[PDB]
Design a protein around this ligand. Structure first.
Ligand SMILES: Cc1cc2nc3c(=O)[nH]c(=O)nc-3n(C[C@H](O)[C@H](O)[C@H](O)COP(=O)(O)OP(=O)(O)OC[C@H]3O[C@@H](n4cnc5c(N)ncnc54)[C@H](O)[C@@H]3O)c2cc1C
Ligand SMILES: Cc1cc2nc3c(=O)[nH]c(=O)nc-3n(C[C@H](O)[C@H](O)[C@H](O)COP(=O)(O)O)c2cc1C
Ligand code: SF4
Ligand code: SF4
Ligand code: F3S
Lengths: 1472, 319, 117
């Protein structure tokens, strides 16, 4: 993957531009996806200006005359198969180009060579042709461009009207032209020989090569698009299309006029995210705005809440945020209007983008540095890009523009500072509220009756209601959930329980919510939805609210402010309406609102206060959905707004799922009354109502921010109405009609069961005389509660069976488990074979099947070391595979003791934290593991309480004892698919023995990501469920995240079979596997290996107390204090007996079924038959969308390849062939090489050889050194061991020093470069990720997210950007330059030595956990002096030498940053 | 709060009086909790998910909820939530065997940590609410048109009668003996259950409006078809009263008295009726050698009552 | 694709249920594509069946006219949202068809349903 742009400053055409463009494109073959056929690609495109002279000469050759004005060429893909459609397309384009007055010059068939493209990509190759037209009316150029664009759009619409598919238009303009296709990005100039002539010379050029997930290519889906390029993916595209449909009707401009009517459906059909972004961008720029203004309005800079920018830019950003909803997502944009060329980043700056200026007036930019070969002495500036920045080139006068100058020129054009104060905030109205109007809070009996009307039990009002008002945050869970799904339940479940939240796997990186809170917002705007193309003051007159949720007092204040334009609507329906009262009520409301909005009302306030004994409350979610979707389909939602009052929402999930429907605000007036009645009963103590309400509001805000960051969105303005949810158990019609766009994999109950349950609950609440709330069990088991999974009798029977070692007791346990009513999905099927029963003495052995099951990872931090080692040895004793999980592991357990038992694990994990990841830790296993997203709590990192980190676990995780460890949810290394491929290559390079696996959690559309990772050479995919365990997590995350692994696994199997990819990767499932029946079912669905998990822990003595998060497990398993540890009763024989019994049961059921071996059943979906629950439930769950399958063909239904998938080798291989004496006699060496950018992960296989021969610290420093010249590739020196010195002359690409383990890497420019060192970038983003030991010396500026998660390493650089030293844990960093904004976010260990002249540090620091001061102790003075001395004597920077020279007056300019919780542990008191 | 302090505390039952000091009276052995020790012992519970304490108790109390309540003050809510699923908490908390029902299966019990004083704190939280009249008679608001009958004043009969009066029916009881209460007033001792609390419970149940019939045998004073003719539904709560015997040589002498007769006469002379079979008979244990046959809590009560009523020598055998 | 199938299912269900007829469920016809040519396999569509039962006590002719209106409106709908290669072979309560681009002889070996008694 890659995107880049070249341009000339002045603007004179020259062949060198396209020459360097094609050359740089020819070197993007290392980031691609090379396959076995080697010919098929996944899309590549180039984009230049029109070569007028060539077409003029050609048309002179034909026989016409070349006019004085410029020409315009239109390039099109026409159907190739049938000769009946090409005539139609020619007819259409000619009819619609001759209807305006222009003169056709003729057609032309571009010469091509189809010999290099593969076969599968050739089966859908369309016919490429071009037409030539010319301005003859003497009209200006801008009118020419506008008219051609309108003609092109009209042709597209007219041809779409005839259903004549397989037709596309590349680009129709007189300034730009596009050559794109599905070939390989290297052989472009061979497919298009036109680019080989000496006349195609342009002022600018764009090149792009994408990385597609699936394998089926479609030509019209190749980048660049019309007037835009892109990299990555946009998270918030679902709500963007809906808001665009809303804005379509309230826009017009005289530039279009009558033909404006021809452009109503702005966003077409059947495109990716970049396609919609491109169409909107084009239709906006054709109105008069330039490129930078449109970029600032579409993807606005992250609005920082500080004074780091002049206020004019702040007013401009406020206006742009008000006028158009942002577009989040990782993106590196290179947009090219016919006048400007702007390269910019997104809000967060998640992807790299580096540019170089030559001394010839030539600017180049892209994702890498050494793609195009540049001379070393002709470089003027090597620059990078941070968040929200943008660099611009103006060809109209030949002028460059960096960030500040460009934005200042932009904000010069209009008086932005005077339009912002026209609006007002809410606090002004709150502060003037007269102290009056106290509503008499309803009686306790009334409140209890209304609460029973929605089944809100009492455990809710004290488990997740008391902490939210008392502490100021949400509750904490301790284990997976075993309550059935919302449809299979029996009690009245709220409608929100049928909605599962979404997240993002490797396709989209989630963003943390505890560090980068400055880049997120919850602003709501009332009275802003309107025109988008015009400019006036009628768009800055509105009201702004800071939070989408409101209390009662503020809501009444707003209602009093809105005056005589607010229309109320009753959301209650008469219970005696009849069998179909709900449909009548919904029709009535969805008609009444459309009536009221046209009468003169601009606000709709949906209320439900009219609930009475004869009228029940319509579910607010469904009513809001219907009303919003009707206002959207009726072209009215823009005209009004929507404020909702509820009576059933209490937790953070309800407000989120209700906002995700389309409502603007949400008010809950029951929770406040319950809080008041609980406060006046003197329960919180002496906390007044105001402070409690404030803490409650803050907790709700935190919850909304967490749930909004769980997906990758930054601003609520794009999430409202986005419909980022999954529905299970709802009918296809109801969801597909009342809700905008939510995929329901299985149809479910309609409007009969819902109304039935609602009326039954209303009757059991109001019609009877109730006085006390029921106890209820949803978070902890009770006798009057629903059916949980782990029942007391079940646990006791299993424990007696595993202790007595009795097969009959285990059989009785399995029977007891199977004889329950339906609880999960696997309770709705039934095995059904057709063959004759085979005697049990003919199926395979017990050990041969035992060698499949494994036990998942368990963090050393959550568990006690005793149970850890016990499970480890119990799995390693028989020969099966075990796990280790995160949290590292003790090194002393690498070799067996005298007794003959190995405490080492067989599988190591690579989580987002990378705590115990050193060189030695990654070479003592036979299988690696990537923890992309955890099962029980996806979209979140591993959590651990503050007092659970003892001395041992801290010395193991390389952390300061006594801190609440929160691993970052983002991965900081997998931002897209190609980065995942790079990490896979790194892991396969460091360990030439084992394999690497990836973990996932089930959701809709996971098959695409599966087929994507299947092209990344990965060979084992572990698909988790949503019923697994954890150490600690919020209950909202446990109960409301993921889907049962049935749909996910059954869809991954289908997808991986559909692209001939099943035969290359294994498949392993886990999550909720208890007995043999479920194991056989999972194997039937298409799995090979399995897991046990919590079940095994029950054999270990776990009693499901669900108090593991307090380090007080009574049986002594999840404990880190020495007192409870001595209560352990674990014994590996228990696990051996458990596995033996499970294998015996599976053998017996398979023998009875009719087969002989498991490897002859995988994929046989036809052996199951769905059985109905009957007519007692009237639900319509049809599981057929899972039982489906595609015939495999010739390959096997399972993996049929032994050994790992080989990957190509880089230069380091040839290095090993030269370093014989170091591995035969051990003598020093000193090598030199000319390294290039297409060599990834240099210096890792040598590191593996060293650590297998000698170890980590077995050598002296600087034993072997390598001098590389020229720029280096990605992931330089990843996992270097102490003794190796990599000296590179030039600059590193990305991820340098990832996981440094004692080595030494130095980067310095070529000594013959006339560049000032401290004024140029020399490293990419994400430097020294996961570093634990070593020294790094730079000679330039650093990228972004610098030295994150450092543990014990030292680093010296000459500058940094945003999020520097984020979540650092230990080591030493010295930055000599300008630090970025939000520095040292969450730093709880180590130090920072900053050098800043203009006193800008107190403005950028994140003064939360760290303190900054002057240097006061002579010891640290000498330490810093010696560090700078080592730097200057190692890399010889002029700036460091000058600093070293004048030392008397420079230390008083240095500042020191030190964490707070480390003041009382430093042996040297930093104070006096 | 936080009620998870079972790591740094020790199980301590309420104040018990020594052995000798009870060898002469008829009062109870265990004393009522002090406020401090009770509030402390209420903290040791673990709020365990899937509580094994509830899954074993027969009436299926909501043990953790009122445990948390009593540990967090406000005894009122605890009392109501404990009464919501039980009609006689004092009897249950005083007599029910915790070693096999409640304190035998606590989650902390299976790790040698010792269970929490569930039964005695149950008795306490029931009784401490009697100082301010927090207990109220469960009388219905409106009267419903139906009469119902129940024979036997045993615990089953008492609970069913209370529930039927809570429904709205008209309840009538029938007992063979005068002082109603089934075996709760004549069979069980006075040192185990001071009859004051049982009399308070009987008075509370009578205050609801249910009519009582002391000294009414169904066999002679009526007949089962006659009860079916009078009341639409008679509930059988006769329990069991026909004892066994042994067929072997030697049973032809005198001084053979079964356990039920001696126990009933002892309970009577404790309460009244001045039965002559104790004084003017061989039912006394002044200085004799009283041996008992059979086993269980029955023979336990026999030997305990014996050592209370003189009986310088007492023996007990079990097969 | 596994995103057009779900959309098509939702369209057909929200079209049929808009009249009142009950929908028992779907069915996947048994097939064996090791007998058809290769070029046809590159364009084979997923073959599904739906079952619908009357609950209004409607007579025969009105039911047939209603099924015809249903099929017409559902074809217009699927034509509306720009998804080609979707088709309905025959939707009735009297007729049924099995047609495909396979060899004429291999019919009984391609659709085993016909070998039933
Ligand atoms: C700590 C402890 C101590 C115990 N001590 C004893 C003990 O000393 N003795 C003992 O027996 N059990 C004892 N038990 C056991 C327990 O008391 C009994 O198992 C339980 O009370 C059974 O009583 P019931 O429900 O059958 O009521 P019962 O009292 O057995 O019901 C009989 C009632 O029906 C009436 N009745 C019977 N027949 C007729 C009729 N024909 N017409 C009218 N009315 C009629 C009787 O007058 C009486 O009111 C003890 C248990 C524990 C835990
Ligand atoms: C106590 C416990 C700790 C766990 N720790 C981790 C962890 O640190 N990282 C991780 O990815 N999964 C962790 N898991 C989840 C397991 O990988 C796996 O999903 C789980 O064993 C399946 O649960 P099940 O037995 O209910 O099917 C943990 C699970 C449990 C029960
Ligand atoms: S008795 Fe045991 S199970 Fe019940 S609340 Fe206490 S610790 Fe938990
Ligand atoms: S304390 Fe004893 S009698 Fe009372 S509910 Fe618990 S087990 Fe039953
Ligand atoms: S909840 Fe955890 S602490 Fe032990 S008793 Fe169960 S495994």
């Amino acid at each position: 993957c890659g995107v880049g742009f070249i341009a000339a400053i002045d603007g004179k055409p020259r062949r060198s531009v396209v020459e360097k463009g094609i050359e740089a494109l020819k070197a993007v073959w290392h980031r691609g996806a090379v396959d076995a056929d080697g010919k098929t690609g996944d899309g590549a495109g180039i984009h230049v200006a029109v070569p007028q002279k060539f077409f003029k000469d050609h048309v002179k050759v034909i026989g016409h005359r070349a006019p004085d004005n410029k020409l315009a060429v239109g390039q099109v893909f026409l159907p190739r198969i049938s000769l009946d459609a090409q005539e139609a397309c020619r007819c259409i384009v000619e009819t619609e180009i001759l209807a305006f007055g222009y003169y056709i010059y003729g057609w032309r068939q571009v010469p091509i060579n189809v010999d290099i493209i593969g076969e599968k990509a050739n089966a859908t190759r369309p016919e490429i042709e071009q037409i030539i037209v010319g301005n003859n009316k003497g009209v200006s150029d801008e009118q020419f461009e506008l008219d051609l664009y309108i003609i092109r759009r009209r042709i597209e619409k007219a041809v779409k009207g005839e259903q004549i598919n397989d037709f596309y238009i590349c680009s129709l303009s007189a300034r730009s032209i596009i050559y794109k296709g599905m070939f390989l990005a290297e052989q472009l100039t061979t497919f298009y020989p036109d680019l080989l002539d000496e006349r195609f010379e342009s002022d600018f050029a764009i090149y792009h090569q994408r990385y597609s997930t699936n394998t089926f290519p479609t030509w019209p889906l190749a980048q660049p698009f019309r007037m835009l390029a892109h990299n990555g993916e946009i998270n918030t595209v679902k709500g963007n299309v809906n808001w665009m449909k809303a804005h379509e009707t309230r826009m017009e401009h005289p530039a279009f006029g009558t033909h404006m009517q021809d452009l109503k459906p702005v966003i077409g059909v059947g495109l990716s995210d970049s396609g919609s972004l491109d169409t909107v961008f084009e239709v906006m720029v054709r109105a008069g705005r330039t490129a930078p203004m449109v970029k600032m309005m579409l993807v606005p800079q992250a609005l920082t809440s500080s004074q780091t920018t002049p206020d004019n830019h702040k007013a401009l950003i406020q206006y742009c945020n008000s006028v158009m909803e942002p577009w989040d997502g990782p993106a590196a944009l290179a947009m090219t209007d016919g006048r400007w060329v702007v390269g910019g980043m997104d809000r967060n700056g998640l992807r790299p983008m580096r540019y170089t200026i030559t001394t010839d007036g030539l600017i180049i930019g892209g994702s890498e540095t050494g793609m195009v070969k540049i001379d070393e002495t002709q470089v003027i500036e090597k620059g990078r890009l941070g968040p929200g920045e943008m660099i611009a080139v103006d060809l109209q006068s030949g002028k460059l523009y960096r960030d500040r100058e460009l934005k200042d020129h932009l904000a010069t054009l209009k008086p932005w500072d005077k339009w912002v104060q026209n609006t007002t905030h809410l606090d002004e109205l709150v502060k003037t509220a007269s102290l009056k109007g106290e509503p008499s809070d309803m009686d306790k009996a009334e409140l209890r009756r209304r609460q029973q009307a929605f089944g809100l039990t009492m455990e809710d009002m004290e488990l997740i209601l008391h902490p939210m008002v008392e502490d100021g945050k949400e509750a904490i869970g301790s284990m997976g959930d075993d309550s059935p799904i919302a449809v299979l339940s029996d009690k009245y479940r709220g409608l929100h329980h049928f909605f599962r939240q979404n997240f993002s796997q490797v396709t989209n990186p989630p963003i943390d919510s505890l560090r980068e809170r400055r880049v997120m917002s919850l602003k709501t705007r009332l009275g802003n939805l309107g025109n988008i193309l015009d400019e006036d003051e009628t768009q800055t007159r509105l009201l702004q609210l800071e939070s989408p949720v409101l209390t009662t007092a503020e809501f009444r204040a707003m209602r009093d402010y809105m005056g005589d334009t607010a229309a109320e609507i009753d959301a209650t329906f008469p219970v005696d309406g009849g069998p179909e009262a709900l449909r009548d009520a919904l029709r009535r409301i969805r008609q009444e609102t459309e009536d009221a909005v046209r009468g003169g009302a601009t606000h709709v306030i949906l209320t439900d206060e009219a609930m009475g004994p004869a009228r029940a409350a319509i579910p607010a979610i469904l009513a809001t959905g219907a009303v919003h979707t009707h206002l959207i389909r009726s072209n009215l939602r823009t005209f009004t707004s929507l404020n909702v009052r509820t009576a059933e929402g209490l937790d953070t999930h309800y407000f989120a799922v209700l906002i995700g429907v389309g409502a603007t605000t949400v008010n809950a007036y029951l929770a406040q009354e319950a809080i008041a009645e609980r406060h006046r009963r003197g329960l919180f103590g002496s906390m007044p109502l105001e402070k409690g309400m404030a803490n409650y509001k803050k907790a709700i805000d935190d919850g909304l921010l967490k749930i909004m960051s769980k997906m990758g969105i930054s601003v609520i303005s794009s999430y409202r109405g986005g419909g980022n949810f999954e529905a299970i158990g709802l009918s296809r019609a109801l969801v597909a009609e009342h809700f905008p766009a939510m995929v329901s994999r299985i149809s479910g109950i309609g409007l009969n069961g819902i109304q039935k349950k609602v009326l039954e609950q209303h009757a059991t609440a109001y019609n009877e005389e109730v006085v006390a709330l029921p106890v209820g069990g949803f978070y902890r088991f009770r006798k009057s509660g629903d059916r949980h999974g782990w029942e007391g009798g079940v646990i006791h029977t299993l424990q007696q069976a595993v202790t007595n070692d009795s097969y009959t007791t285990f059989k009785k346990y399995s029977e007891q488990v199977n004889k329950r009513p339906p609880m999960q999905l696997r309770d709705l099927l039934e095995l059904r074979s057709t063959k004759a029963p085979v005697p049990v003495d003919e199926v395979e052995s017990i050990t041969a099947i035992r060698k499949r099951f494994i036990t998942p990872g368990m963090s050393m931090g959550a568990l006690s070391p005793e149970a850890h080692g016990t499970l480890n040895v119990a799995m390693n004793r028989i020969g099966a595979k075990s796990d280790s999980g995160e949290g590292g592991e003790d090194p002393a357990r690498f070799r067996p003791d005298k007794n003959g038992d190995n405490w080492n694990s067989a599988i190591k994990q690579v989580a987002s934290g990378r705590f115990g990841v050193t060189a030695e830790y990654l070479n003592q296993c036979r299988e690696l593991e990537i923890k992309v997203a955890q099962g029980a709590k996806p979209g979140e990192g591993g959590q651990l309480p503050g007092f659970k980190v003892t001395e041992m676990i801290a010395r193991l995780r390389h952390s300061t004892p006594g801190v609440m460890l929160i691993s970052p949810p983002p991965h900081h290394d997998i931002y897209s698919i190609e980065d995942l491929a790079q990490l896979i290559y790194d892991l396969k390079q460091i360990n030439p023995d084992a394999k690497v696996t990836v973990k996932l959690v089930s959701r809709s559309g996971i098959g695409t990501i599966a087929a994507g990772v299947a092209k990344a050479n990965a060979d084992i995919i572990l698909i988790s469920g949503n019923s697994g365990g954890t150490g600690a997590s919020p209950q909202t995350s446990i109960k409301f995240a993921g889907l049962p692994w049935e749909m996910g696994l059954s869809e991954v199997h289908q997808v991986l079979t559909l692209n001939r990819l099943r035969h290359r990767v294994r498949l392993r499932t886990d999550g909720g596997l208890k007995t043999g029946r479920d194991i056989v079912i999972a194997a039937m669905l298409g799995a090979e290996e399995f897991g046990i998990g919590t079940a095994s822990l029950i054999a270990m003595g776990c009693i499901m107390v669900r108090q593991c998060h307090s380090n007080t497990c009574p049986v002594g398993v999840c404990v880190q204090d020495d007192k409870l540890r001595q209560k352990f009763v674990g014994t590996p024989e228990k696990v051996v007996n458990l596995f033996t019994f499970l294998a015996e049961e599976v053998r017996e059921i398979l023998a009875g079924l009719g087969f002989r071996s498991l490897n002859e059943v995988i994929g046989r979906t036809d052996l199951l038959h769905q059985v109905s629950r009957g007519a007692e439930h009237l639900d319509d769950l049809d599981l057929n969308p899972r039982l489906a399958q595609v015939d495999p063909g010739e390959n096997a239904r399972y993996c049929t390849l032994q050994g790992r998938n080989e990957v190509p080798d880089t230069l380091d291989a040839r290095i090993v062939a030269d370093a014989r004496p170091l591995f035969e006699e051990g003598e020093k060496m000193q090598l030199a090489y000319n390294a290039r950018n297409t060599q990834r992960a240099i210096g890792t296989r040598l590191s593996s050889m060293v650590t297998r021969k000698f170890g980590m610290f077995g050598l002296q420093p600087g034993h072997i050194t390598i001098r590389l010249r020229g720029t280096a590739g990605q992931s330089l020196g990843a996992f270097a061991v102490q003794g190796i010195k990599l000296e590179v002359m030039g600059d590193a690409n990305d991820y340098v020093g990832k996981g440094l383990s004692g080595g030494t890497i130095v980067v310095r420019p070529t000594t013959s470069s006339p560049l000032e060192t401290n004024k140029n970038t020399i490293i990419g983003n994400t430097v020294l990720y996961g570093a634990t030991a070593g020294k790094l010396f730079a000679a330039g500026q650093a990228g972004e997210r610098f030295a994150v998660r450092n543990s014990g390493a030292t680093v010296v650089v000459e500058g940094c950007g945003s999020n520097g030293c984020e979540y650092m844990t230990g080591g030493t960093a010295v930055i000599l330059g300008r630090v970025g904004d939000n520095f040292a976010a969450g730093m709880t260990g180590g130090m920072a030595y900053v050098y800043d002249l203009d006193d800008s540090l107190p403005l950028y620091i994140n003064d939360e956990s760290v303190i900054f001061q002057r240097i006061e102790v002579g010891h640290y003075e000498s330490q810093l002096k010696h560090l700078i001395e080592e730097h200057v004597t190692e890399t010889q920077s002029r700036f460091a030498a000058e600093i070293l020279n004048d030392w008397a007056r420079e230390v008083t300019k240095f500042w020191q940053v030190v964490p707070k919780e480390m003041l009382n542990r430093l042996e040297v008191p930093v104070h006096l | 709060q936080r009620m998870l302090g079972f790591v740094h505390t020790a199980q301590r039952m309420p104040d018990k009086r020594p052995a000798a000091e009870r060898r002469q009276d008829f009062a109870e052995i265990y004393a009522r909790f002090s406020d401090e020790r009770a509030n402390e012992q209420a903290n040791r519970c673990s709020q365990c998910g899937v509580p094994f304490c509830q899954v074993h108790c027969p009436v299926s109390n909501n043990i953790p909820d009122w445990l948390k309540l009593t540990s967090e003050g406000r005894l009122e809510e605890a009392y109501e939530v404990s009464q919501a699923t039980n009609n006689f908490p004092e009897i249950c908390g005083r007599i029910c065997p915790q070693d096999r029902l409640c304190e035998g299966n606590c989650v902390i019990e299976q790790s040698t940590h010792g269970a929490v004083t569930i039964g005695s704190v149950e008795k306490y939280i029931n009784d401490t609410a009697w100082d301010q009249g927090w207990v109220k008679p469960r009388t219905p608001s409106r009267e419903l048109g139906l009469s119902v009958g129940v024979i036997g004043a045993g615990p089953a009969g008492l609970a069913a009668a209370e529930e039927l009066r809570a429904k709205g029916y008209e309840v009538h009881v029938y007992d063979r003996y005068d002082r109603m209460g089934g075996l709760l007033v004549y069979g069980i001792p006075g040192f185990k259950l001071e009859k004051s609390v049982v009399e308070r419970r009987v008075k509370l149940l009578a205050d609801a409006g249910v009519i009582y019939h002391p000294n009414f045998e169904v066999g002679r004073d009526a007949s089962l078809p006659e009860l079916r003719r009078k009341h639409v539904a008679v509930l059988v709560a006769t329990g069991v009263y026909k004892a066994r015997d042994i067929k072997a040589p030697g049973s032809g002498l005198g001084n053979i008295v079964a356990a039920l007769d001696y126990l009933t006469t002892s309970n009577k002379v404790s309460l009244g009726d001045t039965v002559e079979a104790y004084e003017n008979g061989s039912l006394n244990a002044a200085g004799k050698h009283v041996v008992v046959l059979g086993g269980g809590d029955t023979a336990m009560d026999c030997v305990r009552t014996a050592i209370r009523q003189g009986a310088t020598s007492v023996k007990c055998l079990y097969r």
